[PDB]
Amino acid sequence: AERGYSFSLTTFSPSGKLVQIEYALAAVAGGAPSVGIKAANGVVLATEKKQKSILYDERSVHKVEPITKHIGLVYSGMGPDYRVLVHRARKLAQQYYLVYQEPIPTAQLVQRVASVMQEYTQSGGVRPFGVSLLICGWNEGRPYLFQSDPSGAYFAWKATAMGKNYVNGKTFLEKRYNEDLELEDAIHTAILTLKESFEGQMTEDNIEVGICNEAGFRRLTPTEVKDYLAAIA
Amino acid sequence: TTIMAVQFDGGVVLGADSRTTTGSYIANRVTDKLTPIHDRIFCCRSGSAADTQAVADAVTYQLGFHSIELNEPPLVHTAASLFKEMCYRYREDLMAGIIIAGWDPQEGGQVYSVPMGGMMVRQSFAIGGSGSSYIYGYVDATYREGMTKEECLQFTANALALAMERDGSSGGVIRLAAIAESGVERQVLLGDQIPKFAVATL
Amino acid sequence: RFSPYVFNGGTILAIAGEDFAIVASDTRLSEGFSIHTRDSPKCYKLTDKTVIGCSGFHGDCLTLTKIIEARLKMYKHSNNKAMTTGAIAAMLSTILYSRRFFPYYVYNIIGGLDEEGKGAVYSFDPVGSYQRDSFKAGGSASAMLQPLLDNQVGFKNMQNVEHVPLSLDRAMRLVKDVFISAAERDVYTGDALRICIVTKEGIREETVSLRKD
Amino acid sequence: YDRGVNTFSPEGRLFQVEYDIEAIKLGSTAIGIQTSEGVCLAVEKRITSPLMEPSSIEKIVEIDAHIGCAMSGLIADAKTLIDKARVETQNHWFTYNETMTVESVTQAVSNLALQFGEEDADPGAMSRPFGVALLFGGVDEKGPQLFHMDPSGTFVQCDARAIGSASEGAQSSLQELYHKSMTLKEAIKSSLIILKQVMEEKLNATNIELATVQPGQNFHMFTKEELEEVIKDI
Amino acid sequence: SIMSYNGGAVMAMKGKNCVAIAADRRFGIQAQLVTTDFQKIFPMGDRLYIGLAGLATDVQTVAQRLKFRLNLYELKEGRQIKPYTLMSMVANLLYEKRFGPYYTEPVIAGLDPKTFKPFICSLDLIGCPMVTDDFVVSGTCAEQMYGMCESLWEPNMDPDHLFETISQAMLNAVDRDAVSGMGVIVHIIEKDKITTRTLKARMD
Amino acid sequence: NQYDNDVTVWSPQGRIHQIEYAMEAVKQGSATVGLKSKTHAVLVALKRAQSELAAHQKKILHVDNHIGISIAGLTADARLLCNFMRQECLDSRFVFDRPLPVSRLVSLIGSKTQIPTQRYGRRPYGVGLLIAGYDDMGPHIFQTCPSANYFDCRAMSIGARSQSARTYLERHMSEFMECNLNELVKHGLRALRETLPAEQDLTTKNVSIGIVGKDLEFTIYDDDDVSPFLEGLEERPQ
Amino acid sequence: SSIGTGYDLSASTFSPDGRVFQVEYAMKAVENSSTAIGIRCKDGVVFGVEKLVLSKLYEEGSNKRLFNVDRHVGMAVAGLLADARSLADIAREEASNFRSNFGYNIPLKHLADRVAMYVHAYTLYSAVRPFGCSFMLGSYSVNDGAQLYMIDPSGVSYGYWGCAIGKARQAAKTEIEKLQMKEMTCRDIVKEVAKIIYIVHDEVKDKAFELELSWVGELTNGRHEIVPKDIREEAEKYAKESLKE
Amino acid sequence: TTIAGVVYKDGIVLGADTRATEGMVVADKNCSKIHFISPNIYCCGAGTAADTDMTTQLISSNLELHSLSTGRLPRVVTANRMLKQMLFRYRGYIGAALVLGGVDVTGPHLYSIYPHGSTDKLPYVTMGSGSLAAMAVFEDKFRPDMEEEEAKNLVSEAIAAGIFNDLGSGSNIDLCVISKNKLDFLRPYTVPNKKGTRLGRYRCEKGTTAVLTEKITPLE
Amino acid sequence: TQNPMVTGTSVLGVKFEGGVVIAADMLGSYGSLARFRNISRIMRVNNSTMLGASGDYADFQYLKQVLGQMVIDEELLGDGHSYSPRAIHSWLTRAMYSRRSKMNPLWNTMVIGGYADGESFLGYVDMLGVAYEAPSLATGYGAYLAQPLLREVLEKQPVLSQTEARDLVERCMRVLYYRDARSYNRFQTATVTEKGVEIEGPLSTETNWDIAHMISG
Ligand SMILES: [Mg+2]
Ligand SMILES: [Mg+2]
Ligand SMILES: [Mg+2]
Ligand SMILES: [Mg+2]
Ligand SMILES: [Mg+2]
Ligand SMILES: [Mg+2]
Ligand SMILES: [Mg+2]
Ligand SMILES: [Mg+2]
Ligand SMILES: [Mg+2]
Ligand SMILES: [Mg+2]
Ligand SMILES: [Mg+2]
């Protein structure tokens, strides 16, 4: 027989900080890196799918997940927490569509999921999600790229990174690329910004990438991946 | 509808017509009224299609879990009980006339009747459904103790044939199924295969 | 469809004298045009000075009776004393009212002694409306018994008569008469007639016989 | 040191209930005496300022025509128990059409005894005991009666009893003066004599409450004058 | 019947780059008129109007509760509701009362907030929508109204030949319905303006 | 003390202090005794008075015609349990029209009082009980403790200095079964007296007796009513 | 290993080295209890318990540590009795609900898995505490034979041929291994059960005691019954006499 | 309404008239009755339009959520299950009569679901007021393994039988073909009904309508 | 149950010296159809009490289920206590009344037969909760055809022997067969005595149809 803790597990310290949230971000800063680029004609998401042994079947699980026909996700942090948020985003995505009959606007999906993440920083008995997401979408012509973190706060980026070396991965992009970048272009400068930390032999199974153009969102196959890898494609 | 089940030594025989009407219109002349509940347990359904279908899925779900949990073949009596529980409990909201027959490693071949009220009783052979009323006398004068999986399988074929003849709510094709330790074999009797009886003339 | 009620018949009568209370009822329990049993008196002892008679739907009389019994025990544990005839009557009223929208099809009559030692009689309708009376009858023979008592015990419609107190002896015979006369006209009354007499000495029972038809 | 409100001490006593018994010792003192001719209740209002209406301080209240009650301790808490009591007397009257004995009333109130707790509790549930001691004085089928009840939920009858800060002293005096045969007249005098002693302030007719209930007269809260009359014999 | 308790008629028509919507003005209770100035068409943003027929209380209620939702939608989204979306919004609000529905069959008329696209549709009291390229009717004289419409509507119409067309459909239909009338009002919406006229009609 | 405040906390020794502490509540209460012949169950108890002007505490309570009890420990908890016991009995008569078998009633107290000892925030009932009853299995004397445990006794006593009474009872057990009422009661009164300071004994003011048996419904005796039993009591301490 | 710095106050807390001290602590309560043993004969299961004499004032039969959980299932317990009794009610309820639902006597393996999951439920939260008890379930039927199960404070459940719980869990086992129960009949095991009890029982520390014996097998007709006084005495005599050797 | 479906050699064909009526009056001459569940699953709806919509939309929505997690493509039994278990739960109050058809890893499946919740697994089915008319076409001219075109027209012939013989059906015939590799959602497939050519003129000339009040408002 | 489905007709019960006897045919009717010709409408509730039920067989099976568990439960305690005939009859009255009060009755009329303490127990219970004790009981048509015979005998000899009684039951079970259109000449007889509860297999009665040949005359 179970009861429940009704008091919040996150609380302001005298410094005015929300300790658990910072610590959650620490779990993020310690996770596999992720990069997102808004190419003004499609967005790109890519992360380090570092699997320990070769025994791991890279297939069976993904980090770049489709929310709707036109939305997509990637994270940096605790994998299990992510999964929870993926099911809730997909769900939130449907509750919108049933009511409005129009696919959910990317900004709107972000707002909704961010609200959830915020919920877990005040409700009783729980800890904040130890994850940060990068949502990408094509809603009404313009491409979108967003990031919401543990606190439940979100921002729209032209491009960014989260996870290990996200500090360096950002500055790198802070110059190593800019707007007007076309499709395949933003994809290259993305897999590159990734390698700017990717320790090891970055192959087609060490990474996973998805793109979101104004014609749907999808994950790229090991093929199209092995290609871009050869420093081109 | 006309359903029927008979018990023979190492197993059981099950038969039903294929007619399902709404008023006087046949919405399905090829219905499959013998539903698999478990590897060697079956039930014949009569009454509300929606009710019998919904209840059977429920029992199948209930029974499938029970067996895996026990890691053992389920009893035929148990399957009957699960129908009886739902049919008695919701007797005011269901219109189900059910017969459960199957093979039991512990009790062998068995047939249980669970009519409208929700009661449950074991029988040598059972008959249900609208058409059943026209084959009581027949069935009472024909049933023989000690029949074979063949005599039985033919005995229900006649009873179902007769009943299908007189009841508007019954007809189509005769579906059969025999269950015994070895397994389950289901056959069908189309047109000519269906026993016939000459319509009295001058 | 389904009615949750039945009429089992049987009448109940009670009179209160200076120092005694009487509670009588036939003993026939019927249904339809049949007799369930010939030996089913409607009188029951609640305390050493309080008796109740219930008529109507036997299903309810039984349930009601068991509820009253339990509640007296509760009162005793709670106040360290037994319930006075008057409090039992007040209580029975609320118990009947709790089923105001699904009534106990029951006509109860309480017969006993008040705290002052005198005789007391309380009559109730199925939903708890009640009062105290000198005498009252409820049940099928109800309209058969009453009139004779209004005359004999209330000296009504009689000019220049002697308003002598109801001697327990005269009472006991009035009771037997009206029930014997009733047994003649009400198909429900018959078989036997049990009386319960409540006095300072306690509760004494007497069973007179009636037509078994 | 933080524990549940329903924790026992190694001594086999509930901390909270013990800690409130303590709170009563900080309340004003009140006395109740039981005579064959009636019962009386007296308490020091313990006024803390001239600007405070001495009348807007009732430590003695009517539960019902045949029952009065005096309190001491966290008076805010007593408000609740007092109401439950009045309500109880009426439910009894409603149902049985007869007055409730003084013992049953006291008992009814005592059942809210240890009715406090955290987990496995309703929303409108007490979270701690009531820091109150009470004296129920009244008359019923068993004659005049006085009952005492503290936070443990325990209650008993007393010929005379005192509660409050001066309780220990007051009770000593009461033991010296009580007579199984004394009178409501004698009783009231003693009450004030003793109350006068223990009070830190000089006994005024405006700093004390006195009330009686007798086999004939229904609960009566002594007037400012009727106090002068008895105080006249300091 | 419940629907014809207050009487009433509503209609929407599709032009080239314009849209029209009109409604009678009578507010009555069975045989008796009570008011002549009863609003049945409500502004749900510029170039978007909804017309409600049916039971007066639900007309008012469905409209007020719909505004509630329309406003928040526009405060959360950073835009102005698109017609096809407002239709889906009303379809949801009505169906949430599937087993105790509001007694009103709405009519939607408007132009795309970011396009020319004229749009009209009507709904069930339980939220089933219907979109057409010509017209839609609702009220106690559906039949009369269909009569006019199938004989006066032309594929493309300038604002003026639309106004004169929808104005004739109403006045004539509404004049063969005892509980509809007491004046008609029309709304003609063009990418640039909103013309609102109250036609001259019978008052019996 | 990390293992002393919650009944859901086991100590590294496989004990639950909260439960033990509650048991202490019993010991504090004034002593009470119980014993049965083969035809009568008897409860005997010593009542305490706060001050001399206050009455003595109730220690014996009527549950049902065939059951009564004596208490030791928190009074409020006694009333809770008593009312549960009373309710359970009323239900038996209502449904089955027969008195609740004493042993079955005891099993219910056992189940009811066990629950709170296993849930966070709850506390053990702080009262012991001696139960005297008579069912179709004869007289019975049961004991129930703050720990949901209960016992079927030949005789018994709980409370302050109840160790003496137990000892006295253990010495004259063989006698009990064949005693006639008054003798049985005396053994009880005698055992109780064992728990007192030599310079004082049984008064008609501090003794309470409860009797139930094949010939009599549970009845309580408190003041003058106790005299008849006190008479013929050898003021022969031993 | 003295681990216990807050890591032992809640069942919802793991120790730094992967342990749940509250459950372990609950077991100690059991290790401190008096020994009870169960042994699967060839035609049933037999139960015996060293029920210590708490006081000579207590009746013979007080604090029974053996109960009928269903008419064909017996339960032998060790540890905190009140906890055990409530587990006995749960077992009963579980066995009763099963019959109402599936319509036939509950299989010992299932009754055991069920009760075990209930026990386990109490080792996951701070809201409640683990049962401080262990028990064995014994049954016999012709279609299932004899079965003996044992559940402990953690919820774990297993089938045995012979088993013991309590003060002398270990000492009792080394004595059970001496018997070849698989071939033995229940009527003969009673003796051996009472034998292993006296051996293991500490004549010193633990004072006087009583012997409780449970019955269930072909000899009882499937119904779990108490062992007849006659068999008990014989088994007591045999145990006592075998002791003087 | 007349809705039907058939199971042919390579897949499935769904038919449906396009008439919607409010009583005995035609409200919509072109209602879309073949609804989209999954990319390989479609459902025709007859009965209470609104109910046919929302139930169909919900199961679709729930299946997009389902396959979005399994990563595989939806199965027909799943749509059938979800649909029937919901309808059953509402004991018939959700007036939805459905003709469910689609292609699985297990092949082409055609189910008929009634408002009370029972289903029929059949090679060809019909629902709606025109169902008996349509069913006649099938019973008379049905063959197993027909070719796309040989079925694609048997269905438009049965939806036609309904259209003319049932006052509850009319207008266009829509179709839907689903095969192991194709999905042809033929909206107008046939259009055997045309509005008679207007024989007169009525265009309302500007000024014919007397106005009582005017008011303009400029947008931006 | 709002509508009884498969039902059983009348039930009889009479007490004799040292026991009680109950009789009930083995028929389960479905309207006018003798559908289930071999079902027991009698039950053994522990060693001193037995029960016979008229009405909806499904409900009866239900009561049989709950009562069986109750007896089992009690037996587990083996505390030397066990439900007596009056107790079972009391519980049944509470149960039947409770259900009647929820407007969802168990459609049965039952006869409780028992023996305990050298005394004979015989009790009646309605689906409405009407209950009472009497020397003879007959439900259904039996109350119009059997009870008049039973009483007739007892108003002239209150004490019968297990044999005199079984003779009366057979005579009644014959009259019932002759006049109740929903009876079956294939019943059971249950008896309770210090020895316990005994149920007797498929029985029948000699029937005399010689009046059939009196058409003309
Ligand atoms: Mg990552
Ligand atoms: Mg009904
Ligand atoms: Mg009677
Ligand atoms: Mg007569
Ligand atoms: Mg505008
Ligand atoms: Mg008009
Ligand atoms: Mg007019
Ligand atoms: Mg565990
Ligand atoms: Mg050995
Ligand atoms: Mg054994
Ligand atoms: Mg047509």
JSON list of N, CA and C in Angstrom, two decimals, chain C residues 79-110:
[
{"chain": "C", "resi": 79, "resn": "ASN", "atom": "N", "xyz": [-25.71, 5.65, 27.88]},
{"chain": "C", "resi": 79, "resn": "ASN", "atom": "CA", "xyz": [-26.20, 6.43, 29.02]},
{"chain": "C", "resi": 79, "resn": "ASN", "atom": "C", "xyz": [-26.31, 5.65, 30.33]},
{"chain": "C", "resi": 80, "resn": "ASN", "atom": "N", "xyz": [-25.96, 4.37, 30.30]},
{"chain": "C", "resi": 80, "resn": "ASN", "atom": "CA", "xyz": [-26.01, 3.54, 31.49]},
{"chain": "C", "resi": 80, "resn": "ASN", "atom": "C", "xyz": [-27.41, 3.24, 32.03]},
{"chain": "C", "resi": 81, "resn": "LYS", "atom": "N", "xyz": [-28.44, 3.50, 31.23]},
{"chain": "C", "resi": 81, "resn": "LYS", "atom": "CA", "xyz": [-29.80, 3.19, 31.66]},
{"chain": "C", "resi": 81, "resn": "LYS", "atom": "C", "xyz": [-30.62, 2.66, 30.49]},
{"chain": "C", "resi": 82, "resn": "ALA", "atom": "N", "xyz": [-31.78, 2.09, 30.77]},
{"chain": "C", "resi": 82, "resn": "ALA", "atom": "CA", "xyz": [-32.63, 1.59, 29.71]},
{"chain": "C", "resi": 82, "resn": "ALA", "atom": "C", "xyz": [-33.46, 2.77, 29.20]},
{"chain": "C", "resi": 83, "resn": "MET", "atom": "N", "xyz": [-34.02, 2.62, 28.00]},
{"chain": "C", "resi": 83, "resn": "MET", "atom": "CA", "xyz": [-34.81, 3.68, 27.39]},
{"chain": "C", "resi": 83, "resn": "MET", "atom": "C", "xyz": [-36.24, 3.73, 27.92]},
{"chain": "C", "resi": 84, "resn": "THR", "atom": "N", "xyz": [-36.67, 4.94, 28.26]},
{"chain": "C", "resi": 84, "resn": "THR", "atom": "CA", "xyz": [-38.02, 5.12, 28.76]},
{"chain": "C", "resi": 84, "resn": "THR", "atom": "C", "xyz": [-38.98, 5.00, 27.58]},
{"chain": "C", "resi": 85, "resn": "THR", "atom": "N", "xyz": [-40.15, 4.42, 27.83]},
{"chain": "C", "resi": 85, "resn": "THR", "atom": "CA", "xyz": [-41.17, 4.25, 26.79]},
{"chain": "C", "resi": 85, "resn": "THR", "atom": "C", "xyz": [-41.29, 5.48, 25.89]},
{"chain": "C", "resi": 86, "resn": "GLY", "atom": "N", "xyz": [-41.23, 6.66, 26.48]},
{"chain": "C", "resi": 86, "resn": "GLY", "atom": "CA", "xyz": [-41.34, 7.88, 25.70]},
{"chain": "C", "resi": 86, "resn": "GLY", "atom": "C", "xyz": [-40.17, 8.13, 24.76]},
{"chain": "C", "resi": 87, "resn": "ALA", "atom": "N", "xyz": [-38.95, 7.82, 25.21]},
{"chain": "C", "resi": 87, "resn": "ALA", "atom": "CA", "xyz": [-37.78, 8.02, 24.37]},
{"chain": "C", "resi": 87, "resn": "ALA", "atom": "C", "xyz": [-37.78, 7.00, 23.23]},
{"chain": "C", "resi": 88, "resn": "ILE", "atom": "N", "xyz": [-38.19, 5.77, 23.53]},
{"chain": "C", "resi": 88, "resn": "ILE", "atom": "CA", "xyz": [-38.25, 4.76, 22.49]},
{"chain": "C", "resi": 88, "resn": "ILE", "atom": "C", "xyz": [-39.19, 5.24, 21.39]},
{"chain": "C", "resi": 89, "resn": "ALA", "atom": "N", "xyz": [-40.33, 5.80, 21.80]},
{"chain": "C", "resi": 89, "resn": "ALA", "atom": "CA", "xyz": [-41.31, 6.32, 20.84]},
{"chain": "C", "resi": 89, "resn": "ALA", "atom": "C", "xyz": [-40.72, 7.47, 20.02]},
{"chain": "C", "resi": 90, "resn": "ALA", "atom": "N", "xyz": [-39.98, 8.35, 20.67]},
{"chain": "C", "resi": 90, "resn": "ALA", "atom": "CA", "xyz": [-39.39, 9.49, 19.98]},
{"chain": "C", "resi": 90, "resn": "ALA", "atom": "C", "xyz": [-38.39, 8.98, 18.97]},
{"chain": "C", "resi": 91, "resn": "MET", "atom": "N", "xyz": [-37.62, 7.98, 19.37]},
{"chain": "C", "resi": 91, "resn": "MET", "atom": "CA", "xyz": [-36.60, 7.39, 18.51]},
{"chain": "C", "resi": 91, "resn": "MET", "atom": "C", "xyz": [-37.26, 6.71, 17.30]},
{"chain": "C", "resi": 92, "resn": "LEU", "atom": "N", "xyz": [-38.21, 5.82, 17.57]},
{"chain": "C", "resi": 92, "resn": "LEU", "atom": "CA", "xyz": [-38.89, 5.12, 16.49]},
{"chain": "C", "resi": 92, "resn": "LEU", "atom": "C", "xyz": [-39.39, 6.08, 15.42]},
{"chain": "C", "resi": 93, "resn": "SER", "atom": "N", "xyz": [-39.70, 7.30, 15.83]},
{"chain": "C", "resi": 93, "resn": "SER", "atom": "CA", "xyz": [-40.21, 8.31, 14.91]},
{"chain": "C", "resi": 93, "resn": "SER", "atom": "C", "xyz": [-39.15, 8.71, 13.89]},
{"chain": "C", "resi": 94, "resn": "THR", "atom": "N", "xyz": [-37.94, 8.95, 14.39]},
{"chain": "C", "resi": 94, "resn": "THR", "atom": "CA", "xyz": [-36.85, 9.34, 13.53]},
{"chain": "C", "resi": 94, "resn": "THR", "atom": "C", "xyz": [-36.42, 8.15, 12.67]},
{"chain": "C", "resi": 95, "resn": "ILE", "atom": "N", "xyz": [-36.48, 6.94, 13.22]},
{"chain": "C", "resi": 95, "resn": "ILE", "atom": "CA", "xyz": [-36.10, 5.76, 12.45]},
{"chain": "C", "resi": 95, "resn": "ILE", "atom": "C", "xyz": [-37.06, 5.61, 11.28]},
{"chain": "C", "resi": 96, "resn": "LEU", "atom": "N", "xyz": [-38.34, 5.84, 11.53]},
{"chain": "C", "resi": 96, "resn": "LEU", "atom": "CA", "xyz": [-39.30, 5.75, 10.45]},
{"chain": "C", "resi": 96, "resn": "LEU", "atom": "C", "xyz": [-39.08, 6.87, 9.45]},
{"chain": "C", "resi": 97, "resn": "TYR", "atom": "N", "xyz": [-38.71, 8.05, 9.93]},
{"chain": "C", "resi": 97, "resn": "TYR", "atom": "CA", "xyz": [-38.50, 9.15, 9.00]},
{"chain": "C", "resi": 97, "resn": "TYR", "atom": "C", "xyz": [-37.25, 9.03, 8.13]},
{"chain": "C", "resi": 98, "resn": "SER", "atom": "N", "xyz": [-36.28, 8.21, 8.54]},
{"chain": "C", "resi": 98, "resn": "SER", "atom": "CA", "xyz": [-35.10, 8.10, 7.72]},
{"chain": "C", "resi": 98, "resn": "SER", "atom": "C", "xyz": [-35.44, 7.42, 6.38]},
{"chain": "C", "resi": 99, "resn": "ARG", "atom": "N", "xyz": [-36.56, 6.70, 6.34]},
{"chain": "C", "resi": 99, "resn": "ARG", "atom": "CA", "xyz": [-36.98, 6.04, 5.11]},
{"chain": "C", "resi": 99, "resn": "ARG", "atom": "C", "xyz": [-38.14, 6.80, 4.48]},
{"chain": "C", "resi": 100, "resn": "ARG", "atom": "N", "xyz": [-38.22, 8.09, 4.75]},
{"chain": "C", "resi": 100, "resn": "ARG", "atom": "CA", "xyz": [-39.28, 8.94, 4.23]},
{"chain": "C", "resi": 100, "resn": "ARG", "atom": "C", "xyz": [-39.53, 8.77, 2.74]},
{"chain": "C", "resi": 101, "resn": "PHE", "atom": "N", "xyz": [-38.48, 8.55, 1.96]},
{"chain": "C", "resi": 101, "resn": "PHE", "atom": "CA", "xyz": [-38.67, 8.42, 0.52]},
{"chain": "C", "resi": 101, "resn": "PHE", "atom": "C", "xyz": [-38.65, 7.00, -0.01]},
{"chain": "C", "resi": 102, "resn": "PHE", "atom": "N", "xyz": [-38.66, 6.04, 0.91]},
{"chain": "C", "resi": 102, "resn": "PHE", "atom": "CA", "xyz": [-38.73, 4.60, 0.62]},
{"chain": "C", "resi": 102, "resn": "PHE", "atom": "C", "xyz": [-39.19, 4.02, 1.97]},
{"chain": "C", "resi": 103, "resn": "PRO", "atom": "N", "xyz": [-40.40, 4.37, 2.39]},
{"chain": "C", "resi": 103, "resn": "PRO", "atom": "CA", "xyz": [-41.07, 3.98, 3.63]},
{"chain": "C", "resi": 103, "resn": "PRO", "atom": "C", "xyz": [-41.03, 2.53, 4.06]},
{"chain": "C", "resi": 104, "resn": "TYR", "atom": "N", "xyz": [-41.08, 2.33, 5.37]},
{"chain": "C", "resi": 104, "resn": "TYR", "atom": "CA", "xyz": [-41.18, 0.99, 5.94]},
{"chain": "C", "resi": 104, "resn": "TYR", "atom": "C", "xyz": [-42.71, 0.88, 5.91]},
{"chain": "C", "resi": 105, "resn": "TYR", "atom": "N", "xyz": [-43.26, -0.04, 5.13]},
{"chain": "C", "resi": 105, "resn": "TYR", "atom": "CA", "xyz": [-44.71, -0.17, 5.08]},
{"chain": "C", "resi": 105, "resn": "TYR", "atom": "C", "xyz": [-45.09, -0.85, 6.39]},
{"chain": "C", "resi": 106, "resn": "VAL", "atom": "N", "xyz": [-45.26, -0.02, 7.41]},
{"chain": "C", "resi": 106, "resn": "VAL", "atom": "CA", "xyz": [-45.49, -0.52, 8.74]},
{"chain": "C", "resi": 106, "resn": "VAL", "atom": "C", "xyz": [-46.34, 0.37, 9.64]},
{"chain": "C", "resi": 107, "resn": "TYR", "atom": "N", "xyz": [-47.23, -0.25, 10.40]},
{"chain": "C", "resi": 107, "resn": "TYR", "atom": "CA", "xyz": [-48.05, 0.49, 11.35]},
{"chain": "C", "resi": 107, "resn": "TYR", "atom": "C", "xyz": [-47.69, -0.06, 12.74]},
{"chain": "C", "resi": 108, "resn": "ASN", "atom": "N", "xyz": [-46.96, 0.74, 13.53]},
{"chain": "C", "resi": 108, "resn": "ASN", "atom": "CA", "xyz": [-46.53, 0.34, 14.87]},
{"chain": "C", "resi": 108, "resn": "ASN", "atom": "C", "xyz": [-47.33, 0.96, 15.99]},
{"chain": "C", "resi": 109, "resn": "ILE", "atom": "N", "xyz": [-47.46, 0.19, 17.07]},
{"chain": "C", "resi": 109, "resn": "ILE", "atom": "CA", "xyz": [-48.15, 0.66, 18.25]},
{"chain": "C", "resi": 109, "resn": "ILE", "atom": "C", "xyz": [-47.29, 0.25, 19.44]},
{"chain": "C", "resi": 110, "resn": "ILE", "atom": "N", "xyz": [-46.91, 1.25, 20.24]},
{"chain": "C", "resi": 110, "resn": "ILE", "atom": "CA", "xyz": [-46.10, 1.01, 21.43]},
{"chain": "C", "resi": 110, "resn": "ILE", "atom": "C", "xyz": [-46.98, 1.05, 22.68]}
]
